[model samples]
Target: ARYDDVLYFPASRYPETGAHISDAIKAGHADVCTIERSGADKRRQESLKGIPTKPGFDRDEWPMAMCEEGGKGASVRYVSSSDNRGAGSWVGNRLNGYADGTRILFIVQ
Candidate 1:
């Protein structure tokens, strides 16, 4: 699916975060979902500088959740600056305040 087919949460609510994406997956609306910090606040950038980037869940890394069996089965890919453009740069730029605002890209398949 195209970028337009995915749902975006720029100011995502804590309670609805997982449920919203999970529901989308269960409803066949999406296969993949991402979560990243938003805005260009320098304080937010500085606060995240020391966090290590890893491949699995670390709470600090950007999370990309995927559903293989339409939400019945799922996996997660944690990303950082070493990952790739969509995953890495999304966090890198925001962490460095290099971009205006951060974006979480969701891909429906």
Candidate 2:
């Protein structure tokens, strides 16, 4: 079966391709990064093979819910960076800011 929900993790810079995708899938959200495929030869890639999540699980259902109810399944965050940094940088620098924000929307299409 295919995932019913789709999450978008935008890429800020070039390179660090796999790390950006892996981070979100690791946390249970289906993630795809287009920047990796922006060039003439690249193709869209799947970050992770989703480990089946329960239906109606709020974190998977809504991104804001993940913020409200922190856990492994919480909305996985991703960002683009360099200097031998990728997923780790995203979690370190950006995840907390999302947590601190009053409102967040994670759209699944």
TM-score of each: 0.21, 0.23
| Highest lDDT against the true fold, candidate | 1
Which is the leading candidate under TM-score?
2
Per-residue alpha-carbon lDDT of model 2 for 28-71, expressed as tens digits? 65342111112211110121125443343211221222232232
The Cα local distance difference test for each model comes to 0.34, 0.32
Candidate 1 TM-score, true structure as reference? 0.21
Q: After TM-score superposition, what is the CA distance of residue 91 in candidate 1 from its true location, in Å?
A: 11
User: Which stretch of 10 consecutive residues in model 1 shows the poorest summed lDDT?
Assistant: 65-74
Q: 1-109 in candidate 1: lDDT tens per residue? A: 3222234332232222343435545554434332232422432344345555565333221223211122222223232322233333343444353222223245322
Candidate 2 backbone collisions, by pair:
none
